[PDB]
RNA sequence: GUGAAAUACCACCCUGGCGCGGCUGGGGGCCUAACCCUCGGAUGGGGGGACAGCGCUUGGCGGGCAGUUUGACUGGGGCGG
């Protein structure tokens, strides 16, 4: 990685677990990218893909616009928009989509459903952050 | 573009791997100081040595011992039924 990214992860704690208002404004500083950032915030899952009775999908439209499914390995995939909308239009949206997403949990899903969440970019670094609060 | 998956900087993951560290389980070697043996002598020497022995605990072999069980009918009883 470049010094774009060498100055990047010197300013973030994957070490310290963080909350989601804490981590909402840290998204637009850590992209040293040219261009074009669509933000991706990712979560590992508490479910088993090896049974498709527990499989998940659909298409919903987020509140302010562009600007979900499980793989066979069982993690989360979806873009929430363009970098676009500023830090507190993110925190506004940051509790929005997942509380819409959680609704789809199958019954035979064993254990804590959101295993972790790292706010990141299509271009950028990893902070340990909580979907919780 | 004839394979359906796209060959970007990123994450979140799969799979084996190595690395570091955290909680760690298992082996091996040496040591002596507990513990054990010993020494005309000993607050010491020599030998064994964290084994062995002993406590609590686990599962097992276990007539060497112990307590008992080992039915009724029945032309006696058993055998047979
Ligand atoms: Mg030795
Ligand atoms: Mg000795
Ligand atoms: Mg010695
Ligand atoms: Mg001695
Ligand atoms: Mg000695
Ligand atoms: Mg012992
Ligand atoms: Mg007897
Ligand atoms: Mg017996
Ligand atoms: Mg009696
Ligand atoms: Mg009789
Ligand atoms: Mg008779
Ligand atoms: Mg008779
Ligand atoms: Mg008779
Ligand atoms: Mg008889
Ligand atoms: Mg008989």
Q: What angle do CA A124, A75, A55 make, to 5 degrees?
A: 150
CATH number, domain with residue A123: 3.30.190.20
> Is A6 within a domain?
no
Spanning CA of A44 to C1' of B39, the rounded length in angstroms is 73
Q: Which residue range(s) make up the domain with A94?
A: 13-64+68-133
Gap between the Cα atoms of A37 and A7, Å rounded: 18
Dihedral (Cα; A101, A116, A131, A66), 10-degree rounding: -50
The tally of domains found in chain A comes to: 1
> Is A21 within a domain?
yes
> Is A42 within a domain?
yes
Q: Of A115, A93, A117, A113, whose CA–CA distance to A103 is shortest?
A: A113
How many residues in total does chain A contain?
Answer: 133
- A73 C-alpha to center of ligand 2: Å? 61
This entry's atomic model was obtained through X-ray
Q: Which of residues 57-76 of A touch strand B (CB under 7 A)?
A: 73-76
Query: Which pair of tokens denotes residue A86?
Result: 């500023």
């Amino acid at each position: 990685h470049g010094k774009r990214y060498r100055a990047l992860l010197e300013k973030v704690d994957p070490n310290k677990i963080y909350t989601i208002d804490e981590a909402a404004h840290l998204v637009k500083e850590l992209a040293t990218a040219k261009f074009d950032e669509t933000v991706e915030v990712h979560a590992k899952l508490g479910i088993d893909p090896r049974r498709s009775d527990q499989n998940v999908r659909g298409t919903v439209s987020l509140p302010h616009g562009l600007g979900f499914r499980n793989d066979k390995t069982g993690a989360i995939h979806a873009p929430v928009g363009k970098a676009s909308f500023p830090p507190e239009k993110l925190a506004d949206n940051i509790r929005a989509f997942i509380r819409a997403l959680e609704a789809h949990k199958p019954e035979g899903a064993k254990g804590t459903f959101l295993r972790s969440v790292y706010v990141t970019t299509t271009m950028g670094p990893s902070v340990r952050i909580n979907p919780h609060s």
